Design a protein around this ligand. Sequence first.
Ligand SMILES: [Cl-]
Length: 82
Amino acid sequence: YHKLRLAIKEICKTDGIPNIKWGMYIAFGEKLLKSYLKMKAGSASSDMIAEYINNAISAFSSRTGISQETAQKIADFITSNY
Ligand SMILES: [Cl-]
């Protein structure tokens, strides 16, 4: 997901994310994209997709030094581009 990784880095720069943390946001985004595409391909409902995304953002944002707002921007980039 070369294009995604690039886009996540730009989101990280905009949000002033400490660079030691970027790998974590990249991994979160790449994993979420793969799961989102699988769910779309299989005609998951809107409710199911929202629940999965919200669960992913909740779990990731529960880590210290991680921003829920930036996690949400990444999810939003995915759902608006893929
Ligand atoms: Cl990509």
